[PDB]
Amino acid sequence: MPEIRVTPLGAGQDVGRSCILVSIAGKNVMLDCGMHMGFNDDRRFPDFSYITQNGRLTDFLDCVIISHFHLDHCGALPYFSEMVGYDGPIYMTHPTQAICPILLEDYRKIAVDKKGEANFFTSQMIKDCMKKVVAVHLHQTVQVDDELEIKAYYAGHVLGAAMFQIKVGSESVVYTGDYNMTPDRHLGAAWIDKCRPNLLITQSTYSKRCRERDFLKKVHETVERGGKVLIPVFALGRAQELCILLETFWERMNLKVPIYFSTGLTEKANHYYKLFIPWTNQKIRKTFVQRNMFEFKHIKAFDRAFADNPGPMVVFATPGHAGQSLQIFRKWAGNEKNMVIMPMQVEYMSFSAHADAKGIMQLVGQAEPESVLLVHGEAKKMEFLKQKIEQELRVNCYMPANGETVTLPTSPSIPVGISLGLLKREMAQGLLPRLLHGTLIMKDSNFRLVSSEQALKELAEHQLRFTCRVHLHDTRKEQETALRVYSHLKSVLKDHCVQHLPDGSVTVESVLLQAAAPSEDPGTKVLLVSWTYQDEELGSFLTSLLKKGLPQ
C-alpha cells in the first residue's frame, strides 16, 4: 500500500500562507512558509498543530523549500525556523535568498509599527535563520541525504522564482509555486521539461502589449503636455518592470525627462536586480554586453527635494506602504497636469504578475502529469479550472481545503539487473513478439535477473533436465526416422523450424529428441524427447502427435 500523502495547511482554497506538507516515501517535506495577509489574530502564521504539539519539528520534516520571496510564500520563515525551533535544511534560490531578508525585515517594521510584538520575530532571529539556509541554483539536482533529490526550474513570477521537483526513488512531485507563462518585460516564461510526475501542484488565482502601449501613450502625452505622472506600485517585480519599460521607451524616443524612485528600498532592489541578470529575459542577457539596462540614466533621486514642479517630471510611489514620496498630485499639481496610475487623471493599469487559465493548461500539457493538485486561489475559479482539466486533459485532479489530506496511490518500479549477454541475445534473436524467460537471484535487497546458465557459479544452476518418452513400435533407421519425423512436424507445425540437422535428429523450438537404448524387454521400443518449460506446450503436442506412431 504505497502512497504519496499531501496536506495543505494553507492556500488550499485561499490566497495567502502557502504551507503544504508533503510525504512522498517515508520522508516529510514542507513546501512553503508563507503567511496569511489579512487576519492577524494568530492566523497570520501556519498552524503547526498538525505535525507537532510541544516538541521539535526536525524529527519529522526532512526539508523546507521556498518558491520565491513573496510574503504569502515565504513570510513565516523566521517564526517557524527559530521561534518554533526548526534546525534542518532549507532550500531556496539565490535571488530569493538575497531579496527575502530585507523585504521580511520591512514587513517586521510594519508589524512593530502596528505593534504586534506578541507572537512576532525580530531582526536577530532573521539573521540567525538566514545562516541555516542552503541556496539552490537553477536546474540543479540537490541530493540531500541518500535518496531524496530536489530540482528547481524557472517560474517567472519574480526574480528568483522557481518551481520545484521533489524526487525520491522513481516517484516525483512537481510543485509549481507561482508562475506565469505570459512573460514580462524583464523576465522569461516558466519552462519545465516533460518530467511526467506522479503529482503536480499548481496555483490558480485567475493583449498585454496593447495595455503597455496604452500606458506608454498616457505617459508620453502627459509629459508632452506637462502632466506629472505618479505610479503607486507595491510589487518590486512590477516596479522594476515599469522602470525598464519606461527606460526603454525613453531611450527609443530619446527624451530627457527624469524618473524617480524610493531612496531606501528600490535602491537595494535595483542593486540586487543588477547583480542577478542571468535570471532575466534573453533580450536583457543578450543586450548586457553593450551596456547595463539596470544602470539606466533615469536613476534620479526621490525628487528635487519635492520641488521639481508639476511639469513633465516622472516618479514612482506605492499604495497605502513603504514606497517613495508621492509628492506629485497634492503637493504639486492639483489640476489637469497630473496622472496617477493606482491599480488629475485617474487610471488603473493591470499587469499580469500571476498566471491565467491558458498558461496553467499549457503547463499541465507540457509536464504531462499523472495527477494534478490545485492550490492558491479562489475556490470558484479552482472549480472552473478543475472542470476544464477533467474535460479537456482527462486527468484526475484534487481540490483541497486547509487541513485536508489529499492522498494518492503509487506504482513504484523495482530496479533490478540484467546480464548483458542475455539482453543482447534477446534483442538479436527477437528483432528478426516472443517471450523472455529469465531467472532472478533476489539477494538481500540486491536483485539480479539473469539467464539460467549464468547462475552456475553461484552454487546455483544445477540443471533439471526433463525427458518425455514416446512409445513407437518402429525399428527403422535412425536418420530415416528423424527425417520423417522432421518432415511430419514441418507439415503439422506451421513453419517453426525448416532445417536439415547435422546429427540426424529432431528439434523443434528448444526440445531435444533422442533415439535412446530401449528397456530390458526385447519387445519394447521407446523414443525419448527432452525439453524445457519454455517449449513444453509444443512438446506435449509433439508427443501426442507421435503417440499414433510411425507406420509400423
Partner 1 sequence: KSAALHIDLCKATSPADALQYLLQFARKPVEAESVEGVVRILLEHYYKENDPSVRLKIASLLGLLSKTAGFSPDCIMDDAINILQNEKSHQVLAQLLDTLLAIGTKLPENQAIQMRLVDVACKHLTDTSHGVRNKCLQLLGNLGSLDVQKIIGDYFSDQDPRVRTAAIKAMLQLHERGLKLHQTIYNQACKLLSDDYEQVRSAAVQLIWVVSQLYPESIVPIPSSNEEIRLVDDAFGKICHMVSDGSWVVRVQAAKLLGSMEQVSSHFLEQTLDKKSGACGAFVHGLEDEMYEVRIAAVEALCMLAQSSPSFAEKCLDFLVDMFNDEIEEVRLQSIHTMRKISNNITLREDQLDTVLAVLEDSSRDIREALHELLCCTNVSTKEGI
Partner 2 sequence: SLWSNRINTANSRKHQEFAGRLNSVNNRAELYQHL
Partner 3 sequence: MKLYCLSGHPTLPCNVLKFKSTTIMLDCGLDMTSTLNFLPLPLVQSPRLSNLPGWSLKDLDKELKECSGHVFVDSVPEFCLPETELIDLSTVDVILISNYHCMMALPYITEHTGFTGTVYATEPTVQIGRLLMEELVNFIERVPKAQSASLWKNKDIQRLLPSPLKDAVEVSTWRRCYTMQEVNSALSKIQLVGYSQKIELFGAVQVTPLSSGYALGSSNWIIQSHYEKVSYVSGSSLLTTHPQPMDQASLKNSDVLVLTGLTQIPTANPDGMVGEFCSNLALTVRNGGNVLVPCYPSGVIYDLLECLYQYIDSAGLSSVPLYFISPVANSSLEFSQIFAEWLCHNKQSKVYLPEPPFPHAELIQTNKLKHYPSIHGDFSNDFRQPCVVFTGHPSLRFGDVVHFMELWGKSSLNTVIFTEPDFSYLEALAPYQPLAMKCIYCPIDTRLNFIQVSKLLKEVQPLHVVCPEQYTQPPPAQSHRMDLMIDCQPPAMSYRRAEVLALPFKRRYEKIEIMPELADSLVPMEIKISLATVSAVLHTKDNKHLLQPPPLLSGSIPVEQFVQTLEKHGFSDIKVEDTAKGHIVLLQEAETLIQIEEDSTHIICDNDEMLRVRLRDLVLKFLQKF
Site for partner 3 in 31-60 (CB under 8 A): none
Near partner 2 in 440-469, by CB under 8 A:
442, 445
Question: In the complex, what is the shortest distance from the CB of residue 512 to partner 3, in angstroms, rounded to a whole number?
Answer: 11
Based on the shown chain and the rule CB under 8 A, indicate whether residue 539 belongs to the binding site for partner 1.
no
Q: For partner 2, which is the closer residue by CB, 49 or 475?
A: 49
Based on the shown chain and the rule CB under 8 A, indicate whether residue 528 belongs to the binding site for partner 3.
yes
User: Which residue spans within 185-246 are E strands per DSSP?
Assistant: 199-203, 228-230
Q: Which partner from the list partner 3, partner 2, partner 1, none does 141 bind, CB cut-off 5 to 8 Å by kind? A: partner 3
Radius of gyration of the chain (CA): 36
Question: In the complex, what is the shortest distance from the CB of residue 429 to Zn ion, in angstroms, rounded to a whole number?
Answer: 57
Segment interacting with partner 2, rule: CB under 8 A, options 47-55, 136-144, 327-335, 339-347: 47-55
Dihedral sign, CA of 10, 14, 15, 16?
A: negative
Three-class SS state of 180: coil
Question: In the complex, what is the shortest distance from the CB of residue 155 to partner 1, in angstroms, rounded to a whole number?
Answer: 14
Question: In the complex, what is the shortest distance from the CB of residue 45 to Zn ion, in angstroms, rounded to a whole number?
Answer: 17
Q: For partner 2, which is the closer residue by CB, 58 or 519?
A: 58
Distance CA 238, CA 275 (A): 18
Q: Which partner from the list partner 2, partner 3, Zn ion, none does 322 bind, CB cut-off 5 to 8 Å by kind? A: none
Based on the shown chain and the rule CB under 8 A, indicate whether residue 411 belongs to the binding site for partner 2.
no
Three-class SS state of 366: helix
Distance CA 515, CA 478 (A): 7
Residues before each break in the chain (C–N > 2.5 Å)? 206, 320, 343, 432, 459
Question: In the complex, what is the shortest distance from the CB of residue 400 to partner 1, in angstroms, rounded to a whole number?
Answer: 28
Based on the shown chain and the rule CB under 8 A, indicate whether residue 416 belongs to the binding site for partner 3.
yes
Position closest to Zn ion via CB = 70
Distance CA 244, CA 246 (A): 6
Q: C-alpha 519: how far from its chain's center? A: 72
Residue 492: how many other CB atoms lie within 10 Å: 12
Task: Give the residues lining the site for Zn ion (CB under 5 A).
Answer: 70, 72, 157, 178
Q: For partner 1, which is the closer residue by CB, 213 or 274?
A: 213
Residue 143 phi, psi (nearest 5): -70, 125
Q: Which of 29, 102, 116 is nearest to 71 (CA)?
A: 102
C-alpha cell at 545: 502427435
Binding region for partner 1 (CB under 8 A) = 182-183, 185, 188-189, 191, 193-194, 207-210, 212-213, 216-217, 248, 251-254, 281-283, 358, 362, 365-366, 368, 424, 427-428, 431-432
